[model samples]
Target: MKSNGCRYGTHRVIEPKGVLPQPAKILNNDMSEIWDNEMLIDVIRLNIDSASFHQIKNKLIAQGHQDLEKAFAEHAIELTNRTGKHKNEDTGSGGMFIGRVAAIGDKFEMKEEVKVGDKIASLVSLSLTPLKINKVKKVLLDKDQMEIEGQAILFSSGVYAKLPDDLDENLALSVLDVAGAPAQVERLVKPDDTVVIIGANGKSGILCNAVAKERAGICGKVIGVVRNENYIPTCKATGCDEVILAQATDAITIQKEVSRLTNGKMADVVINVVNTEDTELPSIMAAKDRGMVYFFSMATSFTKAALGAEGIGADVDMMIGNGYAHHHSEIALDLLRRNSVLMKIFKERY
Candidate 1:
């Protein structure tokens, strides 16, 4: 018999398991299934470390519930039971997980230098992955790394970057978790270009800011934009040529600030790393005509970005944030080693 393959869009289905009991009819529908090309993992981190499950989680916290692990478990249970997959409803996203190779499928190949008992983090999202949780030990918000005792499966098509042995585990996890942002910035920003990084104080934002500065060089300009005034010092410390403190939700204000900073020339590259909503226009407006805008946030809306840029009559290029770039994990981690200040910040925070 032919080996089974990923059932991402197919009709091959399995009933939800390990959660609360479900109705027969609800559980009877077709759900996605894993095939022989996949491998089972002992999940240590679920990528819920950052903004992944915050929408529901923050609500639960505000409602006076402190048992966040139970809340997370229940939320995962709901999504899996309803969708028969591990995808999140708000972002339709999944995060990378750090786990050990528990079992490899018969047809799975040993591509990387990874093996059973080796620790690895999946570079793909968890939305489509089949997962079963036994416990949630703790949530480390600062590092965006979760300590969990669970099991997950990875498909053959999945791409992963192994955790580096030279770096601190949490620090490596934190940087690797958002490796694409800086890697994309490094790829996009050119020398002498004026780059504007939205949310430049956060995890991905900080990395992009550092990359932008290095890419832009001494003559080039790097602008760091942040909503909170508290991050202003850190923004400057991270290598921004100029800092703008304005609400990302307000496009007009940010555009005016960018106009002032760039002397009305606007930005050559505007990278949106903000985690909040309705940030499309500020990024769109900040870019010069025919400039580039990269939306690296999971919260970004493609419709808003496309239509908003079109409506404004700007002829700029907009790019979505793909978490995978060639050798992205190495590039991002190397950046940390090269910049002492950035490394210090990461070491301090993560």
Candidate 2:
């Protein structure tokens, strides 16, 4: 096809770097048959919003808040020590992460929605290829925490898998191998549901926004709860219309923030993705009478030393914390399927 003026490029199927065995592993899937475009840069730019938390901690330190100041002072030292000690492992394999269109195959036309320069990120299945990983293989994400440096690669909520036209379920599951706790958000959330996602800047937090919009279709308000004032821009850019700033670890402080964002109304859903115990009270307070609180990431659940991955790690925490909510991404998808408009958008985007 390229001989006749068509464009093409190989989607470098690579394993994640830094794992138990190191260098992770690389298994390529010649995706020439999948789509007609070559997307490279688009796939690697998936950055989570909470990356700024690091800067914020530093700023707080410069302002001289002793405890926090000390913590911030020693933050890098802790990272160097921990990372050096463990060697920072990752899952060697996973599914496709969309990148920029380096080139396109001859068969498909460039729809207005797709351009060579535009970026895309979605999880594609690896059923047929069935790349293997060592125990806890570092999948889609790099060895770093949930934070994104330049860009972030987004995957569908665990409740639903996005597939290329010809991809099958077996492949879908293979893609899901990389999904962490955010799968809970897709599983437990519903339409007409209002959710308060604390740590809205992290990986799972981003997915909550994406998945909530998918299910509610204007029927719900997905309120993202972030700490810093700077995160507001990033949250809005990622599809969050409402954001709350609960600066302190105090539950009362967050509750006030949540209360203010909702116009004194209770949130129907609350997904806490924080690594601190301080996040719990505010989340619970923000929840309405019948509302659900899904803890997808937390510090207490794990050892105190690893509290940050549970929020403070140089890396990000992208897992489930509290288990106050139910898993219903599968069921939510069923409802979304019934909603024709959502189905149309989903089909088109994925």
Candidate 3:
């Protein structure tokens, strides 16, 4: 507690001495111990990213466990115990946490009147954070949320947003999970640009649809791709100009649809917000000659995408999704505040 700390949290890595906390083999966790530049938190709930939770759910089903709730709770505890974090080994993803500020280290730098009892949400992923779980209260399968009795550490370089008063706490937490998607859409989409979004009926997908529509304007077109025709109404509610029923994993089929829809011009920007696997090529194939393809899904395989594009002789730019953009949390929360359909669905579902 008395030692000078590393800004990127190298001090918290318990194993693999040379690596940083995020990529380290293990992390250290002690609720009572705080370094000079670390802030302690009394964690209440976690919003696990959809991709990670989906993989865990499939694992549970494959293992033939009937009572998934109990299995998930046990798995959550075991995972934290093993890695000192909530990181899932299969998907290699973690989630965000909402908690009360317990103690602020003497050297930690922060803005906003962050008092001892203020509620806040970590803007960073749980893969790198140091955490200790005392109990797992419950796991909300539908919402990808967990109620747990735990404590965590926020390094000096970490970023967070105090929970907004205007939105329901749980819904706000869910929005923060994919905050970067809409913000990136806001940046990538341009006026009169054709946009195609895979998995447009999902949480991040729907937000991306809304942002794409707004940025593309009336002249531009926003196409929503879902798994089946049942999601057409849901996709349309986000203001998409066209809705295509296509499997996100089927690259050639999606490319054909986008080609036919765009009259072979292809899309100016293709965004993949799908939580499922094998969606990289579809995203790449849906883009124009030199257009941008944003793979916002955690399940994406970089090697497959990189090699698949060259193998297909497709020339395009691929952007790997990073969950952080400039002022992403604020931009994402504001999007829900400004849209009625998004707010209505989030209030009902999240």
Candidate 4:
């Protein structure tokens, strides 16, 4: 009989490493190809949204409430203990990880020029993966990378890339962490199209706006939709043709503004990158008939994006933001390296 083990499913293990518990399944399909050698990793980076929580901590610190961060740390530990996994239920998302290859199952053949001890970042989600944390040294909030002393395992189906040596590791990791945003922008936008990006000042939103501008060309218009006036300068710096300040949750107001800006033609493409819920109508209403809507935020609701678009009788193509693209890591990092303005902003901001 042939062995029929899963490449990315739950495995029975006594004790795994990191904050995640044992006997859990992998969420994203990072390991699809069966490797004869079980892929074990010594983790160096935990790219989870714990970094986003850290930003909240910073805000609390700025407000002179230091205890909030400490409270968050305690809750974080408690949540991990309750779930036996590191998946943040509040965020409805999981982060990927980077590590050095520690051991390979003896029966596996090496494909993709990868070898033991090679530094690589997993292209899969950590939601379902087993992780054991020996220690967390530091959290680089701006870069969205964490310094960790830990271990994780990759299923045979898991995909990863050897860290590019030419780029700064932190920069590359940051770009790769949100690689799907720019890749989808590149895949969807066309020349002379009017592109609109919601959450334009955010990490992924910034990249999408820049890429849309580049791909859409001079004849095209890139409109950045931000929630507050403070982001106007930063959104403009990304080379978007215009910036619209509007409340993200207020779909009607944004729809009206976008229509006004487009001379009633609306947008050719609408990309929603907001980190909160109930903004689907704004995305759908902003797009023209037969236009495209890309929801890149983890906070997006497929049910709302679909039914809301249908409810409004808006005929537009809707896409769920898949976090993977062909050569996504390479494409995103190269975008950061080649675009001087974007690079400077990233360097200064991060």
Candidate 5:
């Protein structure tokens, strides 16, 4: 017989006793027993967080690894073995997963009515999820989706979205992974406002651009910033009024470009979604006084951002990129469904 567990899945915390699952160093992944308040999933695929994947790719390249796919597989399997989750050692971030509900505890209360054999995407980050990997089937870095044979346990507090019938499951899974960014954009962006999206060419960035454009209205302006000129068209297709070619890590250049774009006032709301580090200052500098700066990137350094703002005396509100918001799954899925350009891009890439 299985035992009852805490709402926050504290029972799975194997190391650093007494801490919650999310911040715990390691989690118990034994799938032999299911907790009373837990839901078990037959995991089919994983969407590794962009920041974590970028870090891993860089490390693999640095080691002079030629077979990156093999290296990626090895890294994932080994790390899962060590930590009991697919969290990246360097970035401390994990992506979500799409799976079938294998079993639901008798006493579990799901947020939404779900049943056995239903396809769902885990809304919670994989960093805290209890995972057991039987094998690595495939790894697709371009799409950030990894096919694997695994089982995962979702605590009572864990959130998830039932896969929609109208959209491709894989596409929905990809969008659900970063669903919070667009959902927050819908909530935060105001009409006739000037919004700047840093790293606007990536998966989450492009979606944010689309939502920001819609929420900002016709009189508003949406500016997208990218390091490469090739991404300008892609960002524009997603509703960016103008795509500025600027280095995300360079504060001075980004600030200058944003200033020029806004006629010296800078953006009213700045969204940074880059998966790489050192963009905090640039994002801060791109925003106007008393404006909001949203760092929707896992690679964001709180110290760099907090001290950088204080050091520069930037009077702006900084917001953390929480991966969940109200109806985030629906908002994100609807966005892709409505935006044909985005859907086409997603189809091609993912």
Candidate 6:
């Protein structure tokens, strides 16, 4: 008899061997007709997560895609190039570690003013400076590539590293001197501006909340939305005018809570850090008309099938595993450097 395996378990559980396995058998009460033969199809609703579109943005950013539509064209070209590959070809690579810069070479020249021990991320290109043969395909910590301060945003994951222990504090401060997000917020936010920082306890979210209060002045109000109640105090301490609790899995609940807080008036500017398929629509709903929405997390995902038979974590078969994961953080910084608003946020958060 054919039946949906869901008639037994809610979700699969992983075993000690690190493999997800089926659960114990459970009876199906709705056994009106257990198909003796394979059925053509089953009735099911496809409620695709509308927020999944954000992943498109994440993936585009990961691939150094400045324009989303343009990136699609580039991918088509890439597919055409792959049509000629041999059947026996193998591609894989051992992972690499991309350490945040410990210190800057005293003689190093920076275009946008980099300094010693700054938290910067980088990517390894196959044809360019690669950490190792395997790292060409998996550019985790490919320190072989020389990077400058302001140019770091073009790398993926649009996030920054905290200053490593080795960099000189004075020099690091010098680099951040000119990048003034704090001043930008101070100028833009007025005494009456109400602010909100979602995921307030997170690395980037914490900065957004703190900056808003520091710059917005005492007359303004700051609000932080957290997924857990435990983070409420953290948000308040960071200077949130109010705290709201909601999870990405339930975007409607978040929207409802925000509505209650504003008395139906949407937020003026919603800073969203919760990167997942479920949070997309809720963020839009929570925003006031003509308001701005900022996303800092890379929520995109890749299908495991995309790897095909390519062996991952293999030293010799490096080409099989493209180092997209390693390049994420690097790409994120690059985007911020080029983005006026994001760079503005980066300066303030740091």
Q: Is candidate 1 or candidate 5 better by lDDT?
A: 5
lDDT per residue for candidate 5 within 202-233, as digits (tens), equals: 98999989999999999999999999999999
Segments in model 1 whose C-alpha atoms lie over 4 Å from true places: 1-12, 15-36, 45-96, 103-112, 132-150
In model 1, how large is the Cα lDDT of residue 326?
Answer: 73
lDDT of 3 by residue, 263-322 (tens): 999999999888788888888889999999999887999998999789888899999988
Q: What tens-digit string does per-residue lDDT give for candidate 6 at 95-120?
A: 11123343332223232233444433
Lowest summed lDDT window (length 10), candidate 4? 21-30
Candidate maximizing TM-score: 3
Clashing pairs in 5: none
- Positional deviation of residue 52's Cα in model 1 after best superposition, in angstroms: 7.7
Q: lDDT tens digits, residues 219-299, model 4?
A: 999999987899999898886899998888878888888888899999999999988899888889899999999988878
Clashes of each: 1, 43, 0, 17, 0, 26
- What's the lDDT for all of these models? 0.76, 0.44, 0.88, 0.74, 0.89, 0.40
lDDT of 4: 0.74
Q: What is the C-alpha RMSD of each candidate to the true structure, in Å?
A: 5.7, 15.4, 3.9, 6.3, 4.2, 23.2
Best by lDDT: 5
RMSD, model 6, all Cα superposed?
A: 23.2
Q: Which 10-residue span in candidate 3 carries the lowest summed lDDT? A: 109-118
TM-score of each: 0.76, 0.40, 0.83, 0.76, 0.81, 0.42
CA displacement after TM-score superposition, residue 135 of candidate 3 (Å): 5.7
Give the lDDT of residue 244 in candidate 5: 88
